[PDB]
Structures are given as C-alpha cells and as structure tokens.
C-alpha cells in the first residue's frame, strides 16, 4: 500500500542561534515526503544534547539523531503515514518516560512533524487542512516581538519581550504590513536617538533604554510615526515578562534589581499584580505572558482575578504546552491563555490536545515559536489548522520569524475569500 512509511531518517543541523538541532525526513512507499525540523529555546519535555563540550559546546544532537534512526525508525517504518495519532503514541510508549527523556522530545517531535508533513504531501493537500480538516479559515492575529529586555537587553528592563498586535487590520497581509512598517519606523527612531539597531534572537532590538516606560513610550511613538492608532482599531502592545526569570524562590519575591540594577523595586505577589495593573491602565496593553512565576499559583490566581477580563493573560512556562498543568489552570481560574510551544510537549497530538482543552475553557491557544528556530514553518499551519486566532513567531527580521509570516501569507492567499482575520475578535477570552 502506497500510504505506508518506508523510511525515517534524521540528521544534525543548525537552528537560528548557531546551535545544533535536528531534522527528520520521512518517505512513504509512494514517494510522498516530509521534513520535520525541530526548534529549541522546567516542567518541559526534555531535549537531548550530547554534552560533548568539544562538539558545539556539547549541544550536539547526535544522541537524538541516533535514536530516530536506530530505534524510532524501525518501530515506525511500517505504519500508515496518516496514523498521526497511532504513531505519536507509539513513540511516546516506545520512549516510556513521562517527560520524553529516553529518546528526547527533539527526536520524537522531529519524526512526528515529518510524518504529518509527509501525510499532507501523500494526500496532496496543504498541511493546515490535513492537520485541521476542512474548516480552517482563520489567520492569526500575530504578536510581534519588537523590543527586548531581561537577559537579552542590557537596559534596565526586566520584562523580556515587548510586542505589538495589528488587531485593527482587515487582513493578515495588511496586519503584517502594518507590523513591518512600525518596525522600520522604530528602527529609524532608534537611529535618531543613537541606540543599537542590531537584533537579538527573535529579530527585535534590545536598545539601551532608560527603562520600561521609555520602552513602551517609544513603541507608541513608532506606531504614530507609521500612522496607526494605539488601540482596538490600531495596534496594541503586549508583554512576556518572563517573570520566572527574576523571581527569587527563597525570598519568594519578584527581584527587579537583577535586571534593572540596584535601587530597583523588589516586589511581592500582590505588588507584582498592582504593577502590571498600573501598566495596563496607563497603556493599551492587551496580553501579558508569564506575568508571574511558573510555581506562583496563588499569584497567577490573583493576577487573573484582577486583569482576567480586561487583558489576555498567557501562561508560557506556567503550562509548558501540557494538559496536566493547564487543567489545573482552568480549575483554579489561573490564566485565560496559553503559549503553545510544540517541542515543549514533544508530539503534535499532545500539542493539539493542549490547544483543544484550552478552547473549551475559553482559553486562547497562542501558537509560539522558540528562540532557536528553523526554516520550518509548521507552526504557522498549526495556527490555521486549529483556527487558533493567535501567533507569537517573533519580530519582523530574521528568516526564522519571517518564514512563518510568509508561510501565513501563502495560507492567506491559498484560502482566497475563505480566509478570515479576526483582529481583536480573536480574544474570545474577553
């Protein structure tokens, strides 16, 4: 039979940081072919690294490759390419450990994506429709990393990302246009101001700003210089605080002096909500990723209680694309959104279960990328697959980001008049 998987093959390659990762290629009997590349950035499914400090600083992925070829290959070769779920469970079972540590979630995912991309090819249909069935129409309102703080910046800013969103644009094409044009308008401002216009891991700037206020304030300046409004009818802001980064576990506080230098405001759970609340009043923020630590459940509860109805609140690391942690989130009214990083969980099925569960709680599934990305564009299709309405794939520079933006332009076009773009209406959690 022609649908049947006859080859599965991995090799080591580079992600967009200059670090190894892997691709898996799957052939069917028929000639059909798919290529699954894997990205890379605690409760998060393990990615296998060689540890050999004399190869790529021990970030080699030969371990992973050798598991795809010598173990997963033999097990999987034989299945029908379309048994997307039979296969993902095979690998999971085969692996046997809860956080995919035996074979590694890079190995597993790789295969799993390859097989889908192969099956979509086999049936001679786009990836989003294979994945999603026939009712895939919605193009994601994207949230575009434009300024960086935290580890990435040297400026006195703790929040890791500052993003934007063309919620007010009619089509995703225009939305991207909008988004780009501001990025160039900002880039200009940053030159006139004498700050660094080189870009970090997600294609954003990370300039030496005065602090968090100057940070937002200029993103707004940019928006206006481009000639868009700053609201529901224009462009709006978001954060990834990555607060788990500046949380002191023993003092159980949000230590801003780590990133904003001595004489900076150390905050408790309650104060932290109050700051974020301030920010939201002051500004047209619409989303806030990791407002809190990944083990600060009480905090999360309160945060979401306060802004839960004004502002979309996304648990990134607080859920790790993982049903177990998310169900608890739902139960305890812990967020109203979730960041869906496919490699964080390891297979597409588990990824879809996660995206599914979240919808039925009135939680938005934000499909996201990882810092270490690839020429792959699978996640773009995943946001259309599920009509998720949202996507975080980075800034408007570096093909690691723009591959997806293009990929989505492709999907917009291929969908002709069928395509929708929900802008602000994608926030069914509000």
Tab-separated table of C-alpha atoms in Angstrom:
chain	number	residue	atom	x	y	z
A	1	UNK	CA	0.000	0.000	0.000
A	2	UNK	CA	1.191	3.419	-1.046
A	3	UNK	CA	0.482	5.408	2.153
A	4	UNK	CA	2.879	3.286	4.181
A	5	UNK	CA	6.049	4.697	5.858
A	6	UNK	CA	9.147	3.123	4.383
A	7	UNK	CA	11.874	5.415	5.622
A	8	UNK	CA	12.527	7.682	8.557
A	9	UNK	CA	15.864	9.451	8.698
A	10	UNK	CA	17.389	12.122	10.885
A	11	UNK	CA	20.395	14.375	10.583
A	12	UNK	CA	22.042	17.046	12.670
A	13	UNK	CA	21.738	20.650	11.506
A	14	UNK	CA	21.636	24.237	12.750
A	15	UNK	CA	18.934	26.262	14.422
A	16	UNK	CA	18.956	30.098	14.030
A	17	UNK	CA	21.320	30.639	17.068
A	18	UNK	CA	24.097	28.594	15.527
A	19	UNK	CA	23.278	25.587	17.755
A	20	UNK	CA	22.672	22.142	16.539
A	21	UNK	CA	19.264	20.693	16.381
A	22	UNK	CA	17.783	18.050	14.039
A	23	UNK	CA	15.640	17.325	11.035
A	24	UNK	CA	13.770	14.188	10.311
A	25	UNK	CA	12.720	13.187	6.890
A	26	UNK	CA	10.027	10.644	6.242
A	27	UNK	CA	9.256	8.917	2.965
A	28	UNK	CA	6.291	6.880	2.074
A	29	UNK	CA	6.217	3.947	-0.197
A	30	UNK	CA	4.514	6.219	-2.805
A	31	UNK	CA	7.225	8.783	-2.959
A	32	UNK	CA	5.467	11.154	-0.543
A	33	UNK	CA	7.941	13.072	1.634
A	34	UNK	CA	8.038	15.218	4.713
A	35	UNK	CA	10.664	17.090	6.663
A	36	UNK	CA	10.340	17.762	10.342
A	37	UNK	CA	12.694	20.346	11.765
A	38	UNK	CA	12.847	20.972	15.475
A	39	UNK	CA	13.335	24.250	17.351
A	40	UNK	CA	14.817	24.906	20.798
A	41	UNK	CA	14.670	27.621	23.471
A	42	UNK	CA	11.415	23.047	33.909
A	43	UNK	CA	8.182	21.027	33.648
A	44	UNK	CA	9.016	20.995	29.955
A	45	UNK	CA	9.727	17.830	27.916
A	46	UNK	CA	13.443	17.147	27.672
A	47	UNK	CA	15.617	17.861	24.660
A	48	UNK	CA	18.623	15.609	24.225
A	49	UNK	CA	22.046	17.185	23.974
A	50	UNK	CA	25.298	15.271	23.521
A	51	UNK	CA	27.022	17.017	26.416
A	52	UNK	CA	30.351	16.602	24.475
A	53	UNK	CA	31.953	20.029	25.319
A	54	UNK	CA	34.417	19.647	22.395
A	55	UNK	CA	31.447	19.449	19.926
A	56	UNK	CA	29.271	22.608	19.568
A	57	UNK	CA	29.792	23.248	23.293
A	58	UNK	CA	28.031	19.898	23.972
A	59	UNK	CA	24.886	20.900	22.230
A	60	UNK	CA	25.422	18.293	19.530
A	61	UNK	CA	22.236	16.339	18.732
A	62	UNK	CA	23.777	13.080	17.554
A	63	UNK	CA	22.183	11.327	20.508
A	64	UNK	CA	18.763	12.376	19.208
A	65	UNK	CA	19.544	11.532	15.551
A	66	UNK	CA	20.877	8.081	16.541
A	67	UNK	CA	17.617	7.413	18.368
A	68	UNK	CA	15.442	8.399	15.387
A	69	UNK	CA	17.421	6.212	13.005
A	70	UNK	CA	18.225	3.175	15.134
A	71	UNK	CA	15.136	2.950	17.377
A	72	UNK	CA	12.187	5.128	16.238
A	73	UNK	CA	12.845	4.334	12.575
A	74	UNK	CA	12.400	0.578	12.997
A	75	UNK	CA	9.299	0.942	15.206
A	76	UNK	CA	7.618	3.440	12.940
A	77	UNK	CA	8.569	2.324	9.435
A	78	UNK	CA	5.611	0.098	8.756
A	79	UNK	CA	2.769	2.366	9.940
A	80	UNK	CA	0.419	4.115	7.521
A	81	UNK	CA	1.690	7.726	7.208
A	82	UNK	CA	-1.794	9.057	8.051
A	83	UNK	CA	-1.982	7.282	11.524
A	84	UNK	CA	-0.758	10.530	13.052
A	85	UNK	CA	-2.070	9.545	16.465
A	86	UNK	CA	-1.198	5.810	16.389
A	87	UNK	CA	2.351	6.960	15.679
A	88	UNK	CA	2.730	9.754	18.251
A	89	UNK	CA	1.587	7.206	20.914
A	90	UNK	CA	3.955	4.577	19.536
A	91	UNK	CA	6.920	6.955	20.059
A	92	UNK	CA	5.597	8.008	23.445
A	93	UNK	CA	5.191	4.395	24.568
A	94	UNK	CA	8.460	3.455	22.978
A	95	UNK	CA	10.118	6.227	24.975
A	96	UNK	CA	8.336	5.095	28.131
A	97	UNK	CA	9.248	8.102	30.379
A	98	UNK	CA	6.755	10.931	31.343
A	99	UNK	CA	8.938	13.846	30.099
A	100	UNK	CA	10.373	12.005	26.985
A	101	UNK	CA	13.941	11.710	28.398
A	102	UNK	CA	14.889	8.313	26.970
A	103	UNK	CA	14.592	9.313	23.226
A	104	UNK	CA	14.243	13.041	23.748
A	105	UNK	CA	11.419	15.289	22.648
A	106	UNK	CA	13.573	16.684	19.843
A	107	UNK	CA	13.772	13.165	18.340
A	108	UNK	CA	10.137	12.441	18.806
A	109	UNK	CA	8.709	15.758	17.621
A	110	UNK	CA	11.018	15.650	14.540
A	111	UNK	CA	9.607	12.329	13.458
A	112	UNK	CA	6.049	13.451	14.333
A	113	UNK	CA	6.114	16.653	12.280
A	114	UNK	CA	7.837	14.844	9.420
A	115	UNK	CA	5.094	12.188	9.296
A	116	UNK	CA	2.317	14.878	9.234
A	117	UNK	CA	4.098	16.930	6.546
A	118	UNK	CA	4.584	13.623	4.693
A	119	UNK	CA	0.912	12.689	5.007
A	120	UNK	CA	-0.291	16.053	3.908
A	121	UNK	CA	2.006	15.549	0.948
A	122	UNK	CA	0.807	11.991	0.443
A	123	UNK	CA	-2.873	13.210	0.192
A	124	UNK	CA	-1.700	16.164	-1.859
A	125	UNK	CA	-3.229	18.765	0.455
A	126	UNK	CA	-1.868	21.694	2.489
A	127	UNK	CA	-0.549	20.998	5.893
A	128	UNK	CA	-3.147	23.063	7.693
A	129	UNK	CA	-6.084	21.168	6.145
A	130	UNK	CA	-4.548	17.740	6.787
A	131	UNK	CA	-3.985	18.763	10.350
A	132	UNK	CA	-7.280	20.663	10.794
A	133	UNK	CA	-9.850	19.171	8.466
A	134	UNK	CA	-11.849	21.309	6.065
A	135	UNK	CA	-12.960	24.196	8.372
A	136	UNK	CA	-9.649	26.033	8.532
A	137	UNK	CA	-10.204	29.734	7.709
A	138	UNK	CA	-8.790	31.995	10.431
A	139	UNK	CA	-5.470	33.766	10.087
A	140	UNK	CA	-3.745	34.553	13.269
A	141	UNK	CA	-3.608	37.957	14.727
A	142	UNK	CA	0.138	37.940	15.287
A	143	UNK	CA	2.007	39.233	18.287
A	144	UNK	CA	5.349	40.573	17.041
A	145	UNK	CA	8.379	40.849	19.288
A	146	UNK	CA	9.838	44.324	18.632
A	147	UNK	CA	11.809	45.259	21.812
A	148	UNK	CA	13.728	43.052	24.197
A	149	UNK	CA	14.550	43.253	27.856
A	150	UNK	CA	15.645	40.810	30.528
A	151	UNK	CA	18.570	38.515	29.721
A	152	UNK	CA	18.601	39.790	26.060
A	153	UNK	CA	18.866	43.543	26.899
A	154	UNK	CA	21.424	45.405	28.977
A	155	UNK	CA	18.973	48.251	29.552
A	156	UNK	CA	17.265	48.497	32.977
A	157	UNK	CA	14.245	46.447	31.845
A	158	UNK	CA	13.150	43.120	33.286
A	159	UNK	CA	10.273	42.223	31.045
A	160	UNK	CA	11.766	40.032	28.359
A	161	UNK	CA	9.666	40.930	25.367
A	162	UNK	CA	7.583	43.821	24.302
A	163	UNK	CA	5.286	43.048	21.389
A	164	UNK	CA	2.690	44.552	19.176
A	165	UNK	CA	-0.560	43.378	17.537
A	166	UNK	CA	-2.421	44.710	14.457
A	167	UNK	CA	-5.786	43.866	15.996
A	168	UNK	CA	-7.358	46.579	13.935
A	169	UNK	CA	-6.266	45.373	10.469
A	170	UNK	CA	-8.772	43.772	7.964
A	171	UNK	CA	-6.438	41.018	6.626
A	172	UNK	CA	-3.286	39.274	7.901
A	173	UNK	CA	-1.364	40.626	4.885
A	174	UNK	CA	-2.194	44.162	5.964
A	175	UNK	CA	-1.535	43.290	9.574
A	176	UNK	CA	1.980	42.131	8.664
A	177	UNK	CA	2.437	45.252	6.543
A	178	UNK	CA	1.395	47.376	9.479
A	179	UNK	CA	3.682	45.414	11.736
A	180	UNK	CA	6.695	45.700	9.409
A	181	UNK	CA	6.175	49.430	8.762
A	182	UNK	CA	6.284	50.256	12.502
A	183	UNK	CA	9.424	48.111	12.954
A	184	UNK	CA	11.074	50.287	10.305
A	185	UNK	CA	9.599	53.411	11.892
A	186	UNK	CA	11.036	52.312	15.261
A	187	UNK	CA	14.366	51.373	13.701
A	188	UNK	CA	14.519	54.918	12.347
A	189	UNK	CA	13.667	56.459	15.733
A	190	UNK	CA	16.376	54.327	17.341
A	191	UNK	CA	18.966	55.656	14.883
A	192	UNK	CA	17.921	59.326	15.511
A	193	UNK	CA	18.244	58.556	19.237
A	194	UNK	CA	21.709	56.859	18.896
A	195	UNK	CA	20.708	53.392	20.179
A	196	UNK	CA	21.641	49.941	18.942
A	197	UNK	CA	19.665	48.712	15.867
A	198	UNK	CA	21.240	45.226	15.690
A	199	UNK	CA	18.716	42.497	16.522
A	200	UNK	CA	18.635	39.643	19.057
A	201	UNK	CA	17.392	36.054	18.830
A	202	UNK	CA	13.797	36.901	17.718
A	203	UNK	CA	14.717	39.768	15.369
A	204	UNK	CA	13.794	42.506	17.794
A	205	UNK	CA	16.008	45.310	19.004
A	206	UNK	CA	17.330	45.436	22.559
A	207	UNK	CA	18.418	49.025	22.899
A	208	UNK	CA	19.843	50.796	25.934
A	209	UNK	CA	16.571	52.343	27.034
A	210	UNK	CA	16.101	54.479	30.115
A	211	UNK	CA	13.716	51.858	31.467
A	212	UNK	CA	10.340	50.079	30.968
A	213	UNK	CA	8.493	53.340	30.468
A	214	UNK	CA	10.798	54.709	27.802
A	215	UNK	CA	10.499	51.241	26.292
A	216	UNK	CA	6.755	51.362	25.757
A	217	UNK	CA	6.622	55.057	25.177
A	218	UNK	CA	8.817	54.772	22.046
A	219	UNK	CA	6.962	51.753	20.665
A	220	UNK	CA	3.964	54.114	20.735
A	221	UNK	CA	5.949	56.983	19.092
A	222	UNK	CA	6.694	54.386	16.384
A	223	UNK	CA	3.094	53.358	15.859
A	224	UNK	CA	2.067	57.015	15.410
A	225	UNK	CA	5.040	57.793	13.110
A	226	UNK	CA	3.898	54.898	10.899
A	227	UNK	CA	0.439	56.496	11.142
A	228	UNK	CA	-1.646	54.000	13.086
A	229	UNK	CA	-3.784	54.380	16.181
A	230	UNK	CA	-2.943	52.750	19.553
A	231	UNK	CA	-5.981	50.722	20.415
A	232	UNK	CA	-8.533	48.169	19.330
A	233	UNK	CA	-8.745	49.881	15.899
A	234	UNK	CA	-4.997	50.114	15.503
A	235	UNK	CA	-2.026	48.473	17.163
A	236	UNK	CA	-1.733	47.367	20.772
A	237	UNK	CA	1.014	46.213	22.990
A	238	UNK	CA	1.807	43.034	24.890
A	239	UNK	CA	4.440	41.646	27.280
A	240	UNK	CA	6.301	38.480	28.010
A	241	UNK	CA	7.540	39.422	31.474
A	242	UNK	CA	9.227	36.035	31.786
A	243	UNK	CA	8.867	36.780	35.448
A	244	UNK	CA	10.125	33.276	36.282
A	245	UNK	CA	13.477	34.735	35.287
A	246	UNK	CA	13.530	37.480	38.024
A	247	UNK	CA	11.751	35.577	40.810
A	248	UNK	CA	13.797	34.879	43.996
A	249	UNK	CA	12.488	31.444	45.164
A	250	UNK	CA	13.693	31.661	48.772
A	251	UNK	CA	12.545	35.227	49.464
A	252	UNK	CA	9.536	34.340	47.208
A	253	UNK	CA	9.641	37.851	45.573
A	254	UNK	CA	9.997	39.446	42.076
A	255	UNK	CA	13.512	40.827	42.254
A	256	UNK	CA	13.715	43.705	39.747
A	257	UNK	CA	17.345	44.603	40.879
A	258	UNK	CA	18.602	41.601	38.916
A	259	UNK	CA	17.799	43.326	35.566
A	260	UNK	CA	17.129	46.950	36.428
A	261	UNK	CA	20.194	47.453	38.662
A	262	UNK	CA	20.490	48.224	42.409
A	263	UNK	CA	17.842	50.701	43.710
A	264	UNK	CA	15.194	48.856	41.699
A	265	UNK	CA	11.757	47.840	43.024
A	266	UNK	CA	11.669	44.298	44.607
A	267	UNK	CA	8.028	43.111	44.573
A	268	UNK	CA	5.813	40.526	46.273
A	269	UNK	CA	2.990	38.615	44.588
A	270	UNK	CA	0.390	41.305	45.356
A	271	UNK	CA	2.666	44.229	44.416
A	272	UNK	CA	3.503	42.461	41.149
A	273	UNK	CA	-0.210	42.319	40.225
A	274	UNK	CA	-0.502	46.006	41.160
A	275	UNK	CA	2.446	46.971	38.889
A	276	UNK	CA	1.021	45.043	35.930
A	277	UNK	CA	-2.374	46.538	36.684
A	278	UNK	CA	-0.739	50.032	36.611
A	279	UNK	CA	0.902	49.318	33.346
A	280	UNK	CA	-2.443	48.180	31.822
A	281	UNK	CA	-4.290	51.305	32.991
A	282	UNK	CA	-1.550	53.565	31.747
A	283	UNK	CA	-1.117	51.764	28.449
A	284	UNK	CA	-3.049	49.929	25.712
A	285	UNK	CA	-1.626	46.532	26.653
A	286	UNK	CA	-3.758	43.630	25.518
A	287	UNK	CA	-1.775	40.490	26.527
A	288	UNK	CA	0.714	39.616	29.316
A	289	UNK	CA	2.836	36.458	29.132
A	290	UNK	CA	4.269	34.990	32.319
A	291	UNK	CA	3.087	37.891	34.475
A	292	UNK	CA	4.087	35.630	37.374
A	293	UNK	CA	6.463	32.772	38.266
A	294	UNK	CA	5.810	29.238	36.924
A	295	UNK	CA	5.175	27.970	40.517
A	296	UNK	CA	3.394	31.076	41.897
A	297	UNK	CA	-0.167	29.623	41.616
A	298	UNK	CA	-1.676	31.948	44.281
A	299	UNK	CA	-0.213	34.875	42.332
A	300	UNK	CA	-1.445	33.686	38.981
A	301	UNK	CA	-4.928	33.226	40.573
A	302	UNK	CA	-4.984	36.810	41.867
A	303	UNK	CA	-3.464	38.344	38.677
A	304	UNK	CA	-6.062	36.633	36.541
A	305	UNK	CA	-8.765	37.622	39.008
A	306	UNK	CA	-7.752	41.287	38.562
A	307	UNK	CA	-6.975	41.640	34.798
A	308	UNK	CA	-8.563	38.366	33.667
A	309	UNK	CA	-11.392	40.281	31.919
A	310	UNK	CA	-9.508	43.277	30.572
A	311	UNK	CA	-6.329	41.684	29.324
A	312	UNK	CA	-5.390	38.331	27.940
A	313	UNK	CA	-3.028	36.555	30.395
A	314	UNK	CA	-0.861	33.871	28.929
A	315	UNK	CA	0.917	31.117	30.945
A	316	UNK	CA	4.003	30.245	28.905
A	317	UNK	CA	6.250	28.225	31.158
A	318	UNK	CA	3.398	28.125	33.639
A	319	UNK	CA	1.759	25.446	31.408
A	320	UNK	CA	4.550	24.212	29.077
A	321	UNK	CA	2.035	23.207	26.372
A	322	UNK	CA	0.982	20.474	28.893
A	323	UNK	CA	-2.565	19.311	29.639
A	324	UNK	CA	-1.725	18.299	33.257
A	325	UNK	CA	-0.627	21.792	34.284
A	326	UNK	CA	-3.287	23.538	32.169
A	327	UNK	CA	-6.289	21.614	33.586
A	328	UNK	CA	-5.197	22.924	36.981
A	329	UNK	CA	-5.049	26.367	35.422
A	330	UNK	CA	-8.579	26.082	34.156
A	331	UNK	CA	-9.869	24.729	37.518
A	332	UNK	CA	-8.356	27.435	39.608
A	333	UNK	CA	-9.037	30.249	37.178
A	334	UNK	CA	-5.284	30.581	36.759
A	335	UNK	CA	-4.915	32.189	33.316
A	336	UNK	CA	-7.015	32.974	30.301
A	337	UNK	CA	-4.500	31.916	27.612
A	338	UNK	CA	-1.715	29.502	26.902
A	339	UNK	CA	1.539	29.586	24.902
A	340	UNK	CA	1.716	26.590	22.662
A	341	UNK	CA	5.308	25.577	22.072
A	342	UNK	CA	5.193	22.218	20.254
A	343	UNK	CA	8.647	20.943	21.464
A	344	UNK	CA	7.830	21.834	24.940
A	345	UNK	CA	5.422	18.806	24.760
A	346	UNK	CA	7.009	16.679	22.074
A	347	UNK	CA	4.322	15.499	19.631
A	348	UNK	CA	1.690	17.232	17.517
A	349	UNK	CA	-1.068	15.170	19.045
A	350	UNK	CA	-0.338	16.274	22.611
A	351	UNK	CA	0.030	19.768	21.137
A	352	UNK	CA	-3.482	19.529	19.623
A	353	UNK	CA	-4.937	18.117	22.802
A	354	UNK	CA	-3.484	21.062	24.612
A	355	UNK	CA	-4.891	23.547	22.030
A	356	UNK	CA	-8.233	21.732	22.200
A	357	UNK	CA	-8.573	21.599	26.051
A	358	UNK	CA	-7.754	25.335	26.191
A	359	UNK	CA	-10.506	26.322	23.727
A	360	UNK	CA	-13.158	24.529	25.765
A	361	UNK	CA	-12.162	26.578	28.810
A	362	UNK	CA	-12.426	29.799	26.843
A	363	UNK	CA	-8.659	29.984	26.776
A	364	UNK	CA	-6.874	31.150	23.638
A	365	UNK	CA	-4.129	28.962	22.338
A	366	UNK	CA	-1.309	31.210	21.254
A	367	UNK	CA	0.876	29.181	18.921
A	368	UNK	CA	4.505	30.105	19.613
A	369	UNK	CA	7.968	29.736	18.315
A	370	UNK	CA	11.218	29.194	20.195
A	371	UNK	CA	14.287	31.328	20.302
A	372	UNK	CA	16.215	28.769	18.407
A	373	UNK	CA	14.138	28.459	15.307
A	374	UNK	CA	14.474	26.925	11.806
A	375	UNK	CA	13.442	27.462	8.153
A	376	UNK	CA	10.490	25.240	9.152
A	377	UNK	CA	7.071	26.877	9.222
A	378	UNK	CA	4.889	24.162	10.723
A	379	UNK	CA	3.552	26.230	13.490
A	380	UNK	CA	2.099	28.690	11.035
A	381	UNK	CA	-0.006	25.876	9.674
A	382	UNK	CA	-0.876	24.751	13.261
A	383	UNK	CA	-2.488	28.193	13.950
A	384	UNK	CA	-4.585	27.832	10.839
A	385	UNK	CA	-5.179	24.080	11.482
A	386	UNK	CA	-6.968	24.898	14.709
A	387	UNK	CA	-8.146	28.368	13.750
A	388	UNK	CA	-6.306	29.378	16.985
A	389	UNK	CA	-6.632	33.079	16.126
A	390	UNK	CA	-3.169	33.898	17.526
A	391	UNK	CA	0.513	33.536	16.904
A	392	UNK	CA	3.733	34.548	18.501
A	393	UNK	CA	6.578	33.962	15.916
A	394	UNK	CA	8.759	36.891	16.556
A	395	UNK	CA	9.956	40.179	15.155
A	396	UNK	CA	9.929	41.340	11.569
A	397	UNK	CA	13.584	40.486	10.822
A	398	UNK	CA	15.412	37.185	10.505
A	399	UNK	CA	14.003	34.493	8.254
A	400	UNK	CA	13.495	32.314	11.405
A	401	UNK	CA	10.500	34.563	12.052
A	402	UNK	CA	9.655	35.758	8.587
A	403	UNK	CA	9.457	32.266	7.147
A	404	UNK	CA	6.318	31.946	9.168
A	405	UNK	CA	4.947	35.267	8.307
A	406	UNK	CA	5.462	34.355	4.654
A	407	UNK	CA	4.152	30.901	5.200
A	408	UNK	CA	0.992	32.513	6.556
A	409	UNK	CA	0.845	34.928	3.596
A	410	UNK	CA	0.849	31.772	1.495
A	411	UNK	CA	-2.005	30.296	3.514
A	412	UNK	CA	-3.934	33.587	3.255
A	413	UNK	CA	-3.666	33.567	-0.494
A	414	UNK	CA	-4.415	29.821	-0.896
A	415	UNK	CA	-7.571	30.409	1.139
A	416	UNK	CA	-8.716	33.239	-1.168
A	417	UNK	CA	-12.086	34.715	0.024
A	418	UNK	CA	-12.442	31.970	2.580
A	419	UNK	CA	-9.770	33.424	4.793
A	420	UNK	CA	-10.708	35.388	7.839
A	421	UNK	CA	-8.676	37.536	10.203
A	422	UNK	CA	-10.261	38.258	13.469
A	423	UNK	CA	-8.051	41.029	14.708
A	424	UNK	CA	-9.389	41.982	18.102
A	425	UNK	CA	-12.228	39.461	17.768
A	426	UNK	CA	-9.656	36.612	18.306
A	427	UNK	CA	-9.850	37.397	22.037
A	428	UNK	CA	-12.855	35.143	22.782
A	429	UNK	CA	-11.388	35.079	26.310
A	430	UNK	CA	-12.616	38.807	26.685
